Design an enzyme around this catalytic site. Structure first.
Site, PDB file in Angstrom:
ATOM      1  N   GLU A  97       0.821  -1.207   0.000  1.00 18.00           N
ATOM      2  CA  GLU A  97       0.000   0.000   0.000  1.00 18.00           C
ATOM      3  C   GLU A  97       0.860   1.264   0.000  1.00 18.00           C
ATOM      4  OE1 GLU A  97      -2.606  -0.142   3.310  1.00 18.00           O
ATOM      5  OE2 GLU A  97      -4.260   0.940   2.357  1.00 18.00           O
TER       6      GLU A  97
ATOM      7  N   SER B 146     -11.099   4.862   5.634  1.00 24.37           N
ATOM      8  CA  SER B 146     -11.922   4.454   6.773  1.00 24.37           C
ATOM      9  C   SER B 146     -11.353   5.016   8.072  1.00 24.37           C
ATOM     10  CB  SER B 146     -12.009   2.923   6.832  1.00 24.37           C
ATOM     11  OG  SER B 146     -12.478   2.408   5.574  1.00 24.37           O
TER      12      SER B 146
ATOM     13  N   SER C 205      -4.100   7.175   8.010  1.00 21.56           N
ATOM     14  CA  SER C 205      -2.689   6.814   8.049  1.00 21.56           C
ATOM     15  C   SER C 205      -1.865   8.043   7.697  1.00 21.56           C
ATOM     16  CB  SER C 205      -2.370   5.673   7.066  1.00 21.56           C
ATOM     17  OG  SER C 205      -3.067   4.489   7.419  1.00 21.56           O
TER      18      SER C 205
ATOM     19  N   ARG D   8       5.471   4.950   7.391  1.00 19.80           N
ATOM     20  CA  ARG D   8       4.214   5.250   8.071  1.00 19.80           C
ATOM     21  C   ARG D   8       4.551   5.763   9.469  1.00 19.80           C
ATOM     22  NH1 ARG D   8      -0.108   3.120  11.287  1.00 19.80           N
ATOM     23  NH2 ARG D   8      -2.169   3.394  10.326  1.00 19.80           N
TER      24      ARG D   8
HETATM   25  N1  ANP Z   1     -19.472   6.848  -2.344  1.00 24.03           N
HETATM   26  C1  ANP Z   1     -18.917   6.705  -1.080  1.00 24.03           C
HETATM   27  N2  ANP Z   1     -19.255   5.659  -0.320  1.00 24.03           N
HETATM   28  C2  ANP Z   1     -18.711   5.545   0.871  1.00 24.03           C
HETATM   29  N3  ANP Z   1     -17.857   6.375   1.431  1.00 24.03           N
HETATM   30  C3  ANP Z   1     -17.487   7.451   0.724  1.00 24.03           C
HETATM   31  C4  ANP Z   1     -18.005   7.647  -0.569  1.00 24.03           C
HETATM   32  N4  ANP Z   1     -17.466   8.792  -1.054  1.00 24.03           N
HETATM   33  C5  ANP Z   1     -16.652   9.292  -0.136  1.00 24.03           C
HETATM   34  N5  ANP Z   1     -16.646   8.497   0.966  1.00 24.03           N
HETATM   35  C6  ANP Z   1     -15.822   8.750   2.139  1.00 24.03           C
HETATM   36  O1  ANP Z   1     -14.536   8.177   1.848  1.00 24.03           O
HETATM   37  C7  ANP Z   1     -14.141   7.292   2.902  1.00 24.03           C
HETATM   38  C8  ANP Z   1     -13.387   6.104   2.293  1.00 24.03           C
HETATM   39  O2  ANP Z   1     -12.226   6.646   1.651  1.00 24.03           O
HETATM   40  P1  ANP Z   1     -11.190   5.682   0.870  1.00 24.03           P
HETATM   41  O3  ANP Z   1      -9.902   6.458   0.697  1.00 24.03           O
HETATM   42  O4  ANP Z   1     -11.769   5.125  -0.428  1.00 24.03           O
HETATM   43  O5  ANP Z   1     -10.983   4.515   1.926  1.00 24.03           O
HETATM   44  P2  ANP Z   1     -10.786   2.937   1.923  1.00 24.03           P
HETATM   45  O6  ANP Z   1      -9.543   2.795   1.159  1.00 24.03           O
HETATM   46  O7  ANP Z   1     -11.958   2.259   1.184  1.00 24.03           O
HETATM   47  N6  ANP Z   1     -10.558   2.479   3.451  1.00 24.03           N
HETATM   48  P3  ANP Z   1      -9.065   2.033   3.995  1.00 24.03           P
HETATM   49  O8  ANP Z   1      -9.000   0.500   4.044  1.00 24.03           O
HETATM   50  O9  ANP Z   1      -9.013   2.565   5.365  1.00 24.03           O
HETATM   51  O10 ANP Z   1      -7.798   2.551   3.227  1.00 24.03           O
HETATM   52  C9  ANP Z   1     -15.443   6.829   3.561  1.00 24.03           C
HETATM   53  O11 ANP Z   1     -15.148   6.553   4.934  1.00 24.03           O
HETATM   54  C10 ANP Z   1     -16.327   8.095   3.439  1.00 24.03           C
HETATM   55  O12 ANP Z   1     -16.055   9.005   4.513  1.00 24.03           O
HETATM   56  C1  N1F Z   2      -5.699   0.370   5.942  1.00 24.00           C
HETATM   57  C2  N1F Z   2      -5.208   0.586   7.374  1.00 24.00           C
HETATM   58  O1  N1F Z   2      -4.323  -0.072   7.810  1.00 24.00           O
HETATM   59  N1  N1F Z   2      -5.856   1.624   8.150  1.00 24.00           N
HETATM   60  C3  N1F Z   2      -5.560   1.986   9.528  1.00 24.00           C
HETATM   61  C4  N1F Z   2      -5.091   1.066  10.457  1.00 24.00           C
HETATM   62  C5  N1F Z   2      -4.867   1.477  11.765  1.00 24.00           C
HETATM   63  C6  N1F Z   2      -5.129   2.794  12.118  1.00 24.00           C
HETATM   64  C7  N1F Z   2      -4.907   3.284  13.533  1.00 24.00           C
HETATM   65  C8  N1F Z   2      -3.446   3.327  13.913  1.00 24.00           C
HETATM   66  O2  N1F Z   2      -2.589   3.506  13.126  1.00 24.00           O
HETATM   67  N2  N1F Z   2      -3.139   3.141  15.298  1.00 24.00           N
HETATM   68  C9  N1F Z   2      -4.145   2.914  16.261  1.00 24.00           C
HETATM   69  C10 N1F Z   2      -4.173   4.015  17.313  1.00 24.00           C
HETATM   70  N3  N1F Z   2      -2.801   4.214  17.855  1.00 24.00           N
HETATM   71  C11 N1F Z   2      -2.556   4.524  19.225  1.00 24.00           C
HETATM   72  C12 N1F Z   2      -3.545   4.311  20.185  1.00 24.00           C
HETATM   73  C13 N1F Z   2      -3.214   4.631  21.519  1.00 24.00           C
HETATM   74  C14 N1F Z   2      -1.929   5.122  21.726  1.00 24.00           C
HETATM   75 CL1  N1F Z   2      -1.410   5.540  23.361  1.00 24.00          CL
HETATM   76  N4  N1F Z   2      -1.063   5.289  20.775  1.00 24.00           N
HETATM   77  N5  N1F Z   2      -1.382   4.990  19.519  1.00 24.00           N
HETATM   78  C15 N1F Z   2      -1.710   4.270  16.827  1.00 24.00           C
HETATM   79  C16 N1F Z   2      -1.828   3.167  15.783  1.00 24.00           C
HETATM   80  C17 N1F Z   2      -5.590   3.711  11.197  1.00 24.00           C
HETATM   81  C18 N1F Z   2      -5.819   3.294   9.905  1.00 24.00           C
HETATM   82 MG    MG Z   3      -7.476   3.232   1.283  1.00 28.46          MG
END
Ligand code: ANP
Ligand code: N1F
Ligand code: MG
Ligand code: ANP
Ligand code: N1F
Ligand code: MG
Lengths: 352, 352
Positions: free
Chosen positions: A121, A175, A178, A190
């Site tokens: 990713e 969702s 990052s 990251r």
């Molecule tokens: N058509 C849609 N349907 C759902 N969510 C949408 C839409 N358009 C925008 N969003 C927003 O975009 C976010 C998802 O963004 P996106 O970058 O595509 O994430 P994702 O890659 O599917 N999730 P992740 O696994 O965390 O990387 C959702 O949480 C909504 O806030």
């Molecule tokens: C596609 C993908 O992987 N999505 C993704 C995955 C994980 C996270 C959240 C994250 O990165 N976390 C969790 C919170 N964290 C805390 C929490 C309490 C403390 Cl005291 N410190 N850090 C840091 C690490 C965000 C998006």
């Molecule tokens: Mg994504």
């Protein structure tokens, strides 16, 4: 083999598709109907089934890729509908990234002789972001900022040059969130993440208002007043608190006025939608600012689809980063913000 | 003049009251009935009216303060009920801090000849924290941590020595969150804050579950499963993502599973309460960790009343700070966590 790049996220699948436009007479004859039907189906429709959408405005025209000229197309659909996508495929080399490349690996392999290549990713997002900025958006800037974000009568989208893009803090709002630090084309990491992201906005908004789509949630938020739900600095002090440089309008407690039953009974769904948007967006900005200070990076670019058709959050981020950083940090945005992973995956095709 | 220290917050008023216990024969005769009735009313009751509470377990006994011996008492009531408090007063020198010392200044001045001295919140919290730790909690440690917070069969509250308390990161979880860096007894600053605090927990929990009190919200959360509402790393990848050291159990998107209507229809109020608590607590821990790294401080102490009778959040903070910092940061807790501003205000009395 059609050239595809796929990013299977927790919420949306993003697809980049290269349509060749330099097909010769001999090449057109020596192509199977199944391929010609795929190319015509993708290029003659902008909605695919009930939930697939081609983002026609993002198309890159007359791109030279892998020694061929073509158009680069950008397509999205909900991850919940990936079974329909795979079933249509069952009736080639796929470079795929996102968590779903792992989660759904076995499902993709139900397509006979399909070679699935899972790509990192982080590598995909960085390579795709650098690539799109380098080729430009049909001659226009891929990157922009909001100039004079403090004054609304002047605040305006303006282009930003990323010819030397390092270092860069990339804030990927999907969702969850990052945060990446990019020091060079081959040196990036990251930094951390937060779980308060786009899925929190959509999920909390749905619980609080009953909205049924991302677009409906934004429409509600555009009509609301977050201060009906939030407790502000002026609610606690009676005004500003200059001792710590806190303006009276700053939010002291998100949803903090909802501890009072009479206020819960008077708040509107639109107010709650806007408070959810403001809460999530301010938290993302603050985490981005803290990471930028620790990484010693002053350019913060926001990507992901949380900001799709979401100018409220973009302007809130631009204003907040500039205000709270006293002008030391700049919020940057990208036209292809949701698709860089899918592009980076497509760019891995020569390795296979 | 009874010796009182008051911290008027956005949610709760905290009061520290010094009860002299070395009253001589002549001193008892030369005291007005109104004073004797105040001392007897405060020391013979543990509930005051409908909403005031004396935290008897926190009392410091046989303290020497301002050249006198006495007991230090700790009393709280909702800021919403401050009008009743002021009306009882209308039927002396008051050192007061918190936002309400400013907001309600004119109301306190309705008590004839009352001298109101507004004291800086930061100075009060730091002075009161250092003072209570220095006098000890009736011979026991004021400060504690959870030893072996990673393993639940071993995780246990243990005392922590703050004889040399600098530097210290203080995380004040009230309605919102304020983060302080304390470098010496006279060198400290507010680093930043977040609006996702105790009022967010209580306000969102009330909207989502209909709970009517902080204690009810915690009881609901103790029975819930936050993973019914949250989207975890394993929900997106199918397992852990070791490339970035993310365990499968980490929350990727708070409330992220609530984008699905069928999941919103099956989630319980207890699940939603627990997800709200987890979301707010993890965000506080993460902001604290980022500030500690930037300030180069490895001891993080949490104060405020969000953690009152809230062992779930305390253990979550202890586990999370240790886990995500790879053991570089230690979460610290204090028995008098809600009252340091009120004590620091009382300690300003000699200046007037
Ligand atoms: N058509 C849609 N349907 C759902 N969510 C949408 C839409 N358009 C925008 N969003 C927003 O975009 C976010 C998802 O963004 P996106 O970058 O595509 O994430 P994702 O890659 O599917 N999730 P992740 O696994 O965390 O990387 C959702 O949480 C909504 O806030
Ligand atoms: C596609 C993908 O992987 N999505 C993704 C995955 C994980 C996270 C959240 C994250 O990165 N976390 C969790 C919170 N964290 C805390 C929490 C309490 C403390 Cl005291 N410190 N850090 C840091 C690490 C965000 C998006
Ligand atoms: Mg994504
Ligand atoms: N009896 C209670 N009533 C209300 N909230 C409580 C109670 N007990 C604990 N809490 C929690 O404690 C938080 C308030 O903590 P506290 O440190 O007293 O803040 P405050 O000082 O009144 N607000 P602030 O102006 O932000 O400093 C609330 O948001 C709740 O999460
Ligand atoms: C008693 C009292 O005063 N309580 C209090 C007051 C204010 C706050 C919140 C705070 O301190 N804020 C606001 C968010 N901030 C952002 C936001 C977006 C960005 Cl980009 N950067 N920072 C930082 C500054 C917390 C508690
Ligand atoms: Mg307070």
């Amino acid at each position: 083999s059609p050239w595809f790049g796929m990013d299977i996220g927790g919420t949306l699948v993003k697809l980049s598709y290269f349509e060749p436009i330099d097909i010769t007479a001999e090449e057109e004859q020596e192509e199977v109907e199944s391929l010609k039907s795929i190319r015509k189906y993708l290029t003659s429709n902008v909605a695919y089934g009930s939930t697939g959408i081609r983002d026609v405005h993002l198309e890159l025209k007359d791109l030279t890729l892998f020694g061929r000229r073509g158009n680069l197309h950008f397509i999205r659909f909900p991850t919940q509908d990936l079974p329909t996508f795979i079933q249509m495929g069952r009736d080639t080399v796929l470079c795929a990234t996102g968590g779903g490349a792992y989660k759904f690996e076995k499902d993709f392999r139900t397509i006979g002789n399909l070679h699935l290549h899972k790509l990192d990713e982080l590598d995909c997002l960085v390579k795709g972001l650098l690539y799109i900025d380098s080729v430009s958006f049909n001659g226009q800037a891929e990157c922009y900022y909001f100039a004079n974000a403090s004054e609304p009568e002047r605040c305006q989208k303006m282009p930003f040059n990323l010819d030397d893009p390092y270092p860069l803090l990339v804030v990927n709002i999907g969702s969850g969130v990052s945060i990446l630090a990019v020091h060079s084309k081959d040196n990036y990491k990251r930094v951390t993440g937060t779980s308060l992201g786009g899925g929190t906005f959509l999920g909390l908004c749905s619980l609080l208002t009953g909205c049924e789509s991302f677009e409906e949630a934004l429409e509600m938020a555009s009509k609301g007043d977050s201060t009906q739900a939030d407790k502000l600095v002026r609610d606690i002090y009676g005004g500003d608190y200059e001792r710590f440089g806190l303006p009276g309008w700053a939010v002291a407690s998100s949803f903090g006025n909802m501890i009072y039953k009479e206020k819960r009974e008077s708040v509107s769904k639109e107010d709650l939608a806007r408070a959810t948007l403001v809460t999530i967006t301010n938290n993302i900005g603050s985490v981005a600012r803290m990471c930028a200070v620790n990484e010693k990076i002053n350019r913060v670019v926001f990507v992901g689809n949380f900001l799709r058709v979401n100018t409220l959050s973009m302007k809130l981020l631009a204003y907040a980063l500039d205000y709270w950083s006293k002008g030391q940090l700049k919020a940057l945005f990208l036209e292809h913000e949701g698709y860089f992973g899918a592009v980076g995956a497509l760019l891995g095709l020569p390795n296979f």
